[PDB]
């Protein structure tokens, strides 16, 4: 019964998930002047050409577009990563207003939303094992700002009416996640966690510098989703973001000067 409300929100999570106050929690503020360029960081390799999307699910906190991760079909490699990480799902976090919604912040700036492409390290065999490892996951984070529409997002937006409430899913095949990527793959990277319960400290975060633009109409449709199940009182799925957590003993590295 954790959530994003007054009585079950991020400030309450530590009672069920003590790791909420751990040493490598996410998200964080990215202080751009303190992040250090790391010349040894390899270029990021995003290989989504063979992606097989399957389904879209409202899980009561966000919506997940799920992929077939039983073969190396859509993988993330390079950058700070050792080995091959398979795409399992993507989802977003967003606000009730355009001035908030992202989890990561940049010099304390909040974006309207944040896209998370979640990948797991193939050396651990499946997602459940990977989340128990400090290098188990790689999440590619992409900021959304409100401006021009993102054409590649529209197919997602248009199916949302069919998964309005918690527990609803719909077929979502042949979706190409390359249409959600910005031009540049310049990034910041640091060791962190899942940003929702169970908050496991198993994530290498790769957060892209360049946001994508989405239209006001696109984000408004995100905000029509429901946290609640069908036949329960309507509570709009908005402000499903965790705020910035203490950086503690971590350095954020940049791939770019
Ligand atoms: C092993 C296992 C653990 C947790 C789940 S889950 O579906 O209940 N939770 C989960 O997937 N959490 C999660 C949390 C945060 C993020 S995030 N927001 O950091 O990208 N992605 C996924 C499933 C299998
Ligand atoms: Zn997320």
Q: DSSP of 175-220, one letter per residue? A: --GGGG--S---EEEEEE--SSTT--S-EEEEEESSPEEE-HHHHH
Q: What are the residues facing 169 on neighbouring strands? A: 57
Total residues found in the chain within this entry: 257
Tell me how crowded residue 48 is: count the other CB atoms within 10 A of its CB: 18
Distance CA 46, CA 76 (A): 5
Q: Are 218 and 153 in contact (CB under 8 A)?
A: yes
Q: What are the residues facing 105 on neighbouring strands? A: 29
196 pocket-lining for ligand 1 (C-beta < 6 Å):
yes
204 annotated among ligand-binding-site residues: no
Instruction: Name the H helices within 75-201.
Output: 127-130, 154-159
Give me the half-sphere count of Cα atoms (radius 13 Å) on the Cβ side of residue 147: 7
Distance CA 38, CA 216 (A): 36
Distance CA 189, CA 75 (A): 17
Tell me which H or E stretch contains 249: none
Distance CA 167, CA 59 (A): 6
Ligand 1 probe mutation, 85, 194, 205, most atoms within 8 A of CB: 194
Point out the ligand 1 atom lying closest to the alpha carbon of residue 93: 18
Residues 6 or more apart from 11 whose CB is under 8 A from it? none
Fold for the domain defined by 1-257 = Carbonic Anhydrase II (3.10.200)
Reference 91, options 119, 52, 131; nearest CA is 119
Distance CA 189, CA 205 (A): 5
What's the CA-to-centroid distance between 127 and ligand 1, angstroms?
9
What's the CA-to-centroid distance between 123 and ligand 2, angstroms?
22
- Domain boundaries, given as residue ranges, for the chain: 1-257
The resolution, in angstroms to one decimal, equals 1.5
Q: Tell me the Ramachandran region of residue 145: left when phi exceeds 0, alpha when psi lies from -120 to 50, beta otherwise.
A: beta
- Give the start-end residues of each E strand in the chain: 29-30, 36-37, 44-47, 53-58, 63-67, 75-78, 85-94, 105-106, 113-121, 137-146, 169-171, 187-192, 203-208, 212-214, 253-254
Distance CA 93, CA 111 (A): 10
Q: Are 19 and 200 in contact (CB under 8 A)?
A: yes
Phi, psi of 110 (to 5 degrees): -95, 135
159 pocket-lining for ligand 1 (C-beta < 6 Å):
no
What's the CA-to-centroid distance between 137 and ligand 2, angstroms?
12
Instruction: Summarize the chain as % helix, strand, coil (round to 5).
Output: 15, 30, 55
- Angle CA 233–215–188, to nearest 5: 95
Q: Tell me the Ramachandran region of residue 248: left when phi exceeds 0, alpha when psi lies from -120 to 50, beta otherwise.
A: left
Breaks (C–N over 2.5 Å) after residues, the chain: none
7 annotated among ligand-binding-site residues: no
Closest residue CA from atom 2 of ligand 1: 128
Q: Are 10 and 243 in contact (CB under 8 A)?
A: yes
Residues 6 or more apart from 106 whose CB is under 8 A from it? 29, 30, 32, 143
Q: Are 135 and 73 in contact (CB under 8 A)?
A: no
Q: What are the residues facing 37 on neighbouring strands? A: 254
Dihedral (Cα; 146, 151, 154, 155), 10-degree rounding: -150
Distances (CA, A) of 209 to 13, 122, 124, 140: 29, 26, 29, 11
Q: Report helix, strand or coil for 118.
A: strand
Distance CA 200, CA 13 (A): 13
Distance CA 145, CA 101 (A): 10
93 annotated among ligand-binding-site residues: yes
Residues 6 or more apart from 18 whose CB is under 8 A from it? none
Reference 255, options 95, 110, 38, 90; nearest CA is 38
């Amino acid at each position: 019964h954790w959530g994003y409300g007054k009585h079950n929100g991020p400030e309450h999570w530590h009672k069920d998930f003590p790791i909420a106050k751990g040493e490598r929690q996410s998200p964080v503020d990215i202080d751009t002047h303190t992040a250090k360029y790391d010349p040894s960081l390899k270029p990021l390799s995003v290989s989504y050409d063979q992606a097989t999307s399957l389904r879209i699910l409202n899980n009561g906190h966000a919506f997940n577009v799920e992929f077939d991760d039983s073969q190396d079909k859509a993988v993330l490699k390079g950058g700070p990563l050792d080995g091959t990480y398979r795409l399992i799902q993507f989802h977003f976090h967003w606000g009730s207003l355009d001035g908030q919604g992202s989890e990561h912040t940049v010099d304390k700036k909040k974006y309207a939303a944040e896209l998370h492409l979640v990948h797991w390290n193939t050396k651990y065999g499946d997602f459940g094992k990977a989340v128990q490892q400090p290098d188990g996951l790689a999440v590619l984070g992409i900021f959304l700002k409100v401006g021009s529409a993102k054409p590649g997002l529209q197919k997602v937006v248009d199916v949302l009416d069919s998964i309005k409430t918690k527990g609803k899913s719909a077929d979502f095949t042949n979706f190409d996640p390359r249409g959600l990527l910005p031009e540049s793959l310049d990034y910041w990277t640091y060791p962190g966690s899942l940003t929702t319960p169970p908050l496991l400290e198993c994530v290498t975060w790769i957060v892209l510098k360049e946001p994508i633009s989405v239209s006001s109409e696109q984000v408004l449709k995100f905000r029509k989703l429901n946290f609640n199940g069908e036949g329960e009182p309507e509570e709009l799925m908005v402000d499903n973001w965790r705020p910035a957590q203490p950086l503690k003993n971590r350095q954020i590295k940049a791939s770019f000067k």
